[PDB]
Every structure is written in structure tokens, then in C-alpha cells.
């Protein structure tokens, strides 16, 4: 209660595949969709659609940002309960070149 | 001109061959004007635009051709077009949302948001909207979420509330598959206006000679508004600012439900389904509220229309107030509800008033077996709250219904002059623990019928004598004289008065 629940309890978005908190993003939706939660470094850009007759995309793996790009993949995000200072710690460690991979159990 | 622009919007349609999207936003920015600017597209140039977009649809489904599709859906006041254009614009939406079942995500957002407009304005909204609830079957779901997302506030204007619920009841009669999520949305968002009126209620309103205000009478310029609008609070919520809202919203519900109940739908139609979706909505929403006048009048109106309904509501209401499976204090408010429904509902026969008084004495006839011998054991005088609220639920009947139980032969119905003699003189003294005015009036009218001989036992209370929430369920009558003067006019044929 004292060092989490009453101080900086935030529920963040964590990719289950890369294990990172900072590189997630709520997607700018196509106008007929819902803004979902997507990870950025697991995501591959939609122009990388390089080529059983073909390897076409299942149309729900593609999301956009406010710049206007498109990205395939980057899903498989979940919500965990962290202190917010863990989100600030991970930004101070990236600036040193160090990533923190989080291993999240329901996979 | 009109023959010249037909080769202009076709030349703008040619942005798919070499993929430049040149004249897309130029046409789309002229169609995105309001009605207060005469520089918008007119009735002649729109049919130039619309019929090229309806003769091909492949040469519009680009990511860059998506932009004009917004401004055709956001083409405001489209229900005010001439029938050479109105009956052709509807034909464009019916082919856009069926070629591409993806804009009904965004078109039905408009049709539900335009339910502020009245019935005479939304004759063409629902007749488009009924069409897509059968052609797009997977839209029963997310349109339910639109009707809650776009219901107005408790405290918006009355034109937005009385005409949303008017258009909302229109949607019920042509979509019975939604049904329950129509009434749950109404009755829960009437309690918000409802319960804010009993605590306000002090004085009668002024019967102003004008009852209605007026008939039909008919840019953004946004600045950096981030400062103060201090000390201009005007937070003083009105009397008629919520009494007239509860008039016009809740008269309109009783009008629409009186039309949708009839004996020819109670035989093989869906008029039974209107009743049961209010009965389960009664025992879950309004019955756990506190201090609610003016919404149990909806069930009061509906359970007075036919005789079979009161054979499926009073038996429902007894099963609430006497089952062991119910809560500890739902078995008192419903006894408090049972006494004030029998004593104020008009259109009932004797055979229903008797069967209430049959069981309400037969439960008290069973009461002599076990729960009268625990007086001698050490305990409070409030372990038997279920008994006093049942005896109040029968003495409030005789103060109003005292001429139905007179027979031609000169008897009473299961000893009405004799059974109350034994229950009053017994080892509980219900002349003290119950509400005073419901019990002071039982003895006086029984004194005029020569049953009560117990007016010193009333005086034997100043020295014979969790108490506040036992007073508060007994000073609450669900069917008091209503304050709403417009809605009482509907109930004057249905509501027994004081005399």
C-alpha cells in the first residue's frame, strides 16, 4: 500500500513479445476502427510486405500513427501494474544503451 | 455549367489511373460548408457530384479518396434536401454502406446523434436505420452502445430530452430484438431526474396559463478560451427545470406503452414482452432505490390495462415480499409497496382485492403457529419487522377500500370484523410500532364500522413504550398524491384519490 498503491500506482501497457514498457503506443485508428494498443519495435512497416499461393495480411495486423505510416504486427500487448518510476527508470537506462526485458507470465 | 461540371467531377474521378489525388480536396472543401453560408454546393451541382459517385465506387475507395466520403456523410442538414436529391442522397448511403460495410461504423454514429431532432424531422432517419438493422445484421450490437453514448444529460435542454426519448421509442417498435436495452436506458436515466425532486418538494407550482412555449421557429469562431469565467456560477437548479422535464419525458413513455399494450397483442403478439421487460426492470432498478415517487407510476399504469397482467404482477409482488430467499429489507419496502398499490389502483375486480386479503390474512393466520411465542424470549422488539410491515399493508387497505368487502348477505370476507380484533390485542401491540397516521386512521374507520374497541390501548403507548430506518420505510408511500400536474391527467382515470 505505502510504496505502490498509495504513491505511484499506474497500469501500463507491456508487449508480451519483446518485454518493454516504453515502446508501446495506442494506435491512431483508421476512421472505421478502434484505437488498440501496439508495440513499436516488434512492428514491421507495411511496405515490408515482401514475398501456398501468397502470404497476404489478415487485415487486423495493420495499424497507423498520427504521422500517417502503417505498421504490420506489434500486437500481443497486455496490462501490468507498475510504479511509474519504473517507466522513468527504463528511459534513463535506454539513454545509457541498456534495455530492460520484462518477462510476463501468461503467454 | 451543369453539363460542364459533369466533365469536371469525372476529371476529378480520374485520380486513380496515375494516382495523384489532385481535385479531391477542392470539391470536398465546398461540400463541407454549413447552412448559414450560401456559397456551398447547391441542389444542381450535388446531383452532378452524387451520380458520378454512384455510377462507380471502385474509383473512390482509395486512402486519399477517403476524404470526400467524410464530408458527404458530414454533409449536414441532409434531411432537408428536395426529393430529387433527398430520395437520391439516401440511395447513395444505401450503396456506400453495402458496398463497403465499414462506414456504417461512421454513418450510424450520425443517425443516432441526430435523434435530438423530433419525429416530424426524423421520419427519414429511422426509415434508413430500420433498413440497415436487417441488412447489416451485425449492427444490433454496437448501435446499443450508440444509444447510451448519445443519450443527453440529466440537465440539458428539454428539446433534447423529450425528442431523444421520442425517437428512441420509435426505434423500439421496429427493433424488438434490442428491447431490454431500450427500457434499461430509459428507466435508469429517468431516476436521475426523478430522485432530485422529492427533496426539493416544498410548495405547489404556479399554474401558469401558458403551458407550452413556442412552435417551430426556423460558425465556430473559436478563440483561446483557457482563462476564467469566475463568479458567474448560476448553480441554482430550478423547480420546473426538472418538474417539466419529468412531465414531458414520462408522459411520453406512458403514451407509447399504452399504444403498445392491447388485448390483441396479449394473445399471440409481443405485448406480453413489453410487460415482462418492465417487471424484471422493476424488481432490479427502482425497487432498490430510496425515496422514489413518480417512476412506479409507470408500472402502476401498465399493470392496470388488462386483468391478466394484474394476475402476473400481484402474484409477482407477493412472491417478493414473502420469500425467504429475498433480502432482509427488501421484504419490508415491498410490503410497504403492496399496501399502497391495492389501496390506490382503480381498475381491479373484487376477486383480485380478495386474493391479496386472502393471503395477507393467511400469512397472518400462519403467524400464530411459530412467531408469536418468541415474545417471552430475551430480544428486541424489532426482530419481527416483517410482521409490522405486513399489518400496515392490510390496515392501509381498509382506510381506502372499506366498501368493496360489503356483501349482500351481511357478513364479512373471512371475519374482517373479528380477525383485526385478535391481532391488535395480541402480544405485540401493532398500534405502537407501525406508522402512526396509517394506524390512527385504521382505528377510526373501524370505529365507524364497530370493530376496534382499542382506543385506550392507543393511549397505553406513552408509558408502554435500529429505529430510524424502521420509521423511514413506513413514512414512505409509493403511491402518494402525485405533484406532476401534466402526468396526473393521464392517471386520473387510473388513480383512486383520497375519496
Amino acid at each position: 500500500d505505502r510504496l505502490l498503491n498509495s504513491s505511484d500506482y499506474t497500469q501500463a501497457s507491456v508487449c508480451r513479445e519483446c518485454g518493454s514498457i516504453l515502446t508501446t503506443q495506442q494506435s491512431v485508428p483508421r476512421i472505421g476502427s478502434i484505437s488498440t494498443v501496439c508495440c513499436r519495435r516488434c512492428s514491421m512497416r507495411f511496405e515490408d510486405a515482401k514475398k501456398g499461393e501468397k502470404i497476404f495480411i489478415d487485415d487486423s495486423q495493420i495499424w497507423e500513427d498520427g504521422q500517417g505510416n502503417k505498421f504490420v504486427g506489434g500486437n500481443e500487448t497486455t496490462t501490468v501494474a507498475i510504479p511509474f518510476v519504473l517507466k522513468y527508470l527504463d528511459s534513463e537506462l535506454s539513454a545509457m544503451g541498456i534495455r530492460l526485458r520484462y518477462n510476463v507470465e501468461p503467454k | 455549367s451543369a453539363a460542364m461540371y459533369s466533365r469536371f467531377v469525372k476529371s476529378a474521378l480520374d485520380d486513380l489511373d496515375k494516382n495523384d489525388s489532385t481535385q479531391i480536396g477542392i470539391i470536398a472543401n465546398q461540400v463541407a460548408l454549413p447552412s448559414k453560408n450560401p456559397e456551398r454546393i447547391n441542389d444542381k451541382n450535388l446531383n452532378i457530384l452524387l451520380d458520378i459517385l454512384s455510377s462507380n465506387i471502385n474509383r473512390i475507395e482509395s486512402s486519399r479518396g477517403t476524404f470526400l466520403i467524410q464530408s458527404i456523410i458530414n454533409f449536414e442538414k441532409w434531411w432537408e434536401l428536395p426529393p430529387h436529391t433527398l430520395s437520391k442522397y439516401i440511395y447513395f448511403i444505401k450503396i456506400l454502406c453495402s458496398s463497403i460495410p465499414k462506414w456504417w461504423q461512421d454513418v450510424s454514429m450520425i443517425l443516432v446523434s441526430c435523434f435530438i431532432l423530433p419525429i416530424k424531422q426524423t421520419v427519414c432517419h429511422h426509415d434508413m436505420l430500420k433498413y440497415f438493422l436487417r441488412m447489416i445484421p451485425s449492427s444490433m450490437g454496437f448501435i446499443d452502445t450508440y444509444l447510451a453514448k448519445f443519450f443527453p444529460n440529466k440537465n440539458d435542454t428539454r428539446r433534447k430530452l423529450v425528442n431523444y426519448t421520442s425517437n428512441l421509442l420509435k426505434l423500439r417498435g421496429y427493433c424488438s430484438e434490442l428491447g431490454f436495452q431500450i427500457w434499461s436506458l430509459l428507466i435508469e436515466k429517468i431516476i436521475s431526474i426523478d430522485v432530485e425532486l422529492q427533496n426539493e418538494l416544498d410548495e405547489l407550482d404556479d399554474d401558469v396559463d401558458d403551458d407550452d412555449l413556442e412552435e417551430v421557429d426556423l460558425m465556430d469562431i473559436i478563440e483561446g478560451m483557457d482563462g476564467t469565467e469566475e463568479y458567474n456560477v448560476e448553480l441554482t437548479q430550478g423547480i420546473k427545470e426538472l418538474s417539466t422535464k419529468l412531465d414531458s419525458i414520462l408522459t411520453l413513455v406512458s403514451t407509447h406503452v399504452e399504444e403498445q399494450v392491447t388485448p390483441e397483442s396479449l394473445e399471440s403478439g409481443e405485448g406480453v414482452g413489453v410487460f415482462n421487460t418492465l417487471t424484471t426492470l422493476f424488481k432490479t432498478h427502482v425497487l432498490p432505490t430510496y425515496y422514489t415517487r413518480s417512476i412506479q407510476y409507470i408500472m402502476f399504469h401498465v399493470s392496470q390495462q388488462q386483468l391478466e397482467l394484474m394476475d402476473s404482477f400481484l402474484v409477482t409482488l407477493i412472491d417478493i415480499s414473502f420469500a425467504v430467499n429475498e433480502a432482509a429489507e427488501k421484504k419490508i419496502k415491498s410490503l410497504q409497496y403492496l399496501g399502497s398499490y391495492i389501496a390506490r389502483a382503480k381498475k381491479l375486480s373484487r376477486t383480485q382485492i380478495i386474493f391479496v386479503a386472502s393471503y395477507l390474512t393467511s400469512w397472518l393466520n400462519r403467524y400464530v403457529i411459530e412467531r408469536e411465542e418468541e415474545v417471552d424470549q430475551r430480544g428486541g422488539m424489532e426482530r419481527f419487522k416483517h410482521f409490522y410491515a405486513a399489518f400496515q399493508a392490510l390496515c392501509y387497505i381498509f382506510c381506502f377500500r372499506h366498501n368493496i368487502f360489503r356483501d349482500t348477505d351481511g357478513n364479512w370476507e373471512c371475519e374482517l370484523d373479528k380477525f383485526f380484533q385478535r391481532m391488535v390485542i395480541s402480544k405485540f401491540n401493532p398500534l405502537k410500532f407501525c406508522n402512526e397516521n396509517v394506524m390512527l386512521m385504521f382505528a377510526r374507520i373501524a370505529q365507524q364500522e364497530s370493530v376496534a374497541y382499542c382506543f385506550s390501548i392507543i393511549e397505553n403507548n406513552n408509558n408502554e413504550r435500529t429505529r430510524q430506518q424502521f420509521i423511514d420505510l413506513q413514512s414512505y408511500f409509493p403511491y402518494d398524491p402525485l405533484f406532476l400536474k401534466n402526468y396526473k391527467i393521464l392517471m386520473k382515470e387510473y388513480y383512486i384519490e383520497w375519496s
Binding site: 510504496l3 505502490l4 500506482y9 501494474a81 507498475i82 510504479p83 519504473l86 527508470l89 537506462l93 545509457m96 541498456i98 518477462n103 | -
Partner: protein, 47 residues
């Protein structure tokens, strides 16, 4: 000497198991001493 031990851990590619109470307050996990030394499991009656 926080970034001194951080240098020794990053070069090690060290998986922190998150079991010490100084490492559970960082990630916000429940401490494993006292009332966090077991699990409470609820017994549901129906199949």
C-alpha cells in the same frame, strides 16, 4: 555504486529473478516475507 553494479549485470546478461525485497519494490511485485510467503486460493463449489 548503482551504475557500477549495473555495468557488471548488463555484461553478464543477468536475469533478475525478482525475489529479494529490494527488487520487488522496484518492479512493484508483492514482497515474499510474512503475508506474501504463501497463496490464498478460493474454493469454488460448482464443477
Amino acid at each position: 555504486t548503482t551504475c557500477q553494479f549495473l555495468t557488471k549485470a548488463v555484461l553478464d546478461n543477468e536475469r533478475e529473478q525478482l525475489d529479494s525485497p529490494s527488487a520487488r519494490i522496484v518492479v512493484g511485485k508483492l514482497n515474499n516475507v510474512g503475508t506474501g510467503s504463501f497463496d490464498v486460493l478460493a474454493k469454488v463449489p460448482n464443477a
